[PDB]
Design a protein around this ligand. Structure first.
Ligand SMILES: NC(=O)c1cc([N+](=O)[O-])c(Cl)cc1NCc1ccc(Cl)nc1
Length: 294
């Protein structure tokens, strides 16, 4: 290439291929994401460029945005593993509660920062949470979804994961709020605890109905305005709500309480990242060292 020497292909994200690369000059190791298609919005590059200013210990640093050859390259600080792989690796024994709590606490700090700066993630999922050997966890891809509006798919035949999508997005809301990220994080929290995806839908309607089957079909009482949402249908089946005690066993009441607040149907009732940080669940939070095999 130029100043980068490709080390390996880390995968193919929701936008393009990703390579672990080394700056032939500085020797720094980074993750290089090649963005897919022939023009590239000048509006996007401006907004993206703004994200370079988004510095927080729990947010993967966006080192550079390179628009050349009329194609886009994003250079990110590199982390060795993502939470999806770590969760799979910890499946037999489960991630210890102190580490689950540490990660959740750090992720909420990251979200509180992004949200206070009017930046939404919009597509939080285990694969987008990166971890290192020091016990840190960081949010990857903040603000990229907005600088591109609607996601749809990756770029070339790849099944988009809907498991962490907030119900307002599924019901067609056109304006996302910071609440969508809290919902996704609540789903991730539940998954670390039970070692199974909370709402593993395989279609937009299956996703919505899995949510309804567990939290109850929403109505005007718990979610004012829900029946007027774009894709709401009076024909939706009416399921009764289940008990959290059965949803995320054996999580304690502090944890169930916080999760319930992160999973409220009304985006406006859903707890903020800042408020969640003050929840009693974090009274004894610590920063454990994970057993990471690289
Ligand atoms: N910032 C990053 O470091 C990073 C970025 C992206 N991405 O989307 O631009 C992706 Cl996919 C993975 C990453 N690393 C985690 C990782 C995963 C697997 C291996 Cl072998 N090595 C590292």
């Amino acid at each position: 290439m130029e100043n980068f020497q490709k080390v390996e292909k880390i995968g193919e994200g929701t936008y393009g291929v990703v390579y672990k690369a080394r700056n032939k000059l500085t020797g720094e190791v980074v993750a290089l994401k090649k963005i897919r298609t022939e023009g590239v919005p000048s509006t996007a590059i401006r907004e993206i460029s703004l994200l370079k200013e988004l510095n927080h210990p729990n947010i993967v640093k966006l080192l550079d945005v390179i628009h050349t050859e009329n194609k886009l390259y994003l250079v990110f600080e590199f982390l060795h593993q993502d939470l999806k792989k770590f969760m799979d690796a910890s499946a037999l024994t489960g991630i210890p509660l102190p580490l689950i709590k540490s990660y959740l606490f750090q992720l909420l700090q990251g979200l509180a920062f992004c949200h206070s700066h009017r930046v939404l993630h919009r597509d939080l999922k285990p694969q987008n949470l990166l971890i290192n050997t020091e016990g840190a966890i960081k949010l990857a891809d903040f603000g990229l979804a907005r600088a591109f509006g609607v996601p749809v798919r990756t770029y070339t035949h790849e099944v988009v994961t809907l498991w962490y999508r907030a119900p307002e997005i599924l019901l067609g809301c056109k304006y996302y709020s910071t609440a969508v990220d809290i919902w996704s994080l609540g789903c991730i929290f539940a998954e670390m605890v039970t070692r199974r995806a909370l709402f593993p839908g395989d279609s937009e309607i299956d996703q919505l109905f899995r949510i309804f089957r567990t939290l109850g079909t929403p109505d005007e009482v718990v979610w004012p305005g829900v029946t007027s949402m774009p894709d709401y249908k009076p024909s939706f089946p009416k399921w009764a709500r289940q008990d959290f005690s059965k949803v995320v066993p054996p999580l304690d009441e502090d944890g169930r309480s916080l999760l319930s607040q992160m999973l409220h149907y009304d985006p406006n009732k859903r707890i903020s990242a800042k408020a969640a940080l003050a929840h009693p669940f974090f009274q004894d939070v610590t920063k454990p060292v994970p057993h990471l095999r690289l």
